[PDB]
Design a protein around this ligand. Sequence first.
Ligand SMILES: Nc1nc2c(ncn2[C@@H]2O[C@H](COP(=O)(O)OP(=O)(O)O)[C@@H](O)[C@H]2O)c(=O)[nH]1
Length: 214
Amino acid sequence: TTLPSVLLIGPSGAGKTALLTLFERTSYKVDLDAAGATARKFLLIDTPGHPKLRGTTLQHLLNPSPSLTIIPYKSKLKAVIFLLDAAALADSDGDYLSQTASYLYDVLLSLQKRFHSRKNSRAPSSIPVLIAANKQDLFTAVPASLVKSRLEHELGRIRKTRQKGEGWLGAVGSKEFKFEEMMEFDMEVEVMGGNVIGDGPGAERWWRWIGERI
Ligand SMILES: Nc1nc2c(ncn2[C@@H]2O[C@H](COP(=O)(O)OP(=O)(O)O)[C@@H](O)[C@H]2O)c(=O)[nH]1
């Protein structure tokens, strides 16, 4: 067994490869020898963003006690970073918002189903989720507080449309979706801005948030 794992999840173009590169400077090929993994005491596990390949990642999130197979060999999953392009989110057609929120919906619903799976009465270990709103260096980037409200409204729209036509994300009696409501399933979900390149807040706040929780 190695250091614990953090799954890095998100649509293509979000900056996952770039983030992993910054961090360093089925089964997963991971450089254990990387200075970033030794100094922070966790492994950052890049996953594919292509829609056809998301099922594999979601399967880890359903498991009451997920361990990742790591090829430099079992690592405990302790957190998720969901990375998105905060600039692409600002597009007028709303396409990126919709497709990104759809993925996030599945990620959170998977962790919710995990919480609810009780082959024995005991609650599973917590897996917090950092929604990392990347590319804040760009002038067109949506700020984290707006990323939060836009995502919440879209996740709300999805659950309402699906119920009209478990599939329901969040609390049964919730009338307006909020990430905070996921604490009913001991799921801490927070939206935080940052950037991997360019001038801005950088990535350290993301690393701190994860570090305090694993
Ligand atoms: N402006 C800006 N561009 C970024 C940032 N992070 C990544 N990128 C760029 O976004 C593109 C997609 O990044 P990549 O790591 O390949 O994304 P991936 O598909 O999620 O693995 C690349 O051109 C990166 O250089 C950022 O914080 N700001």
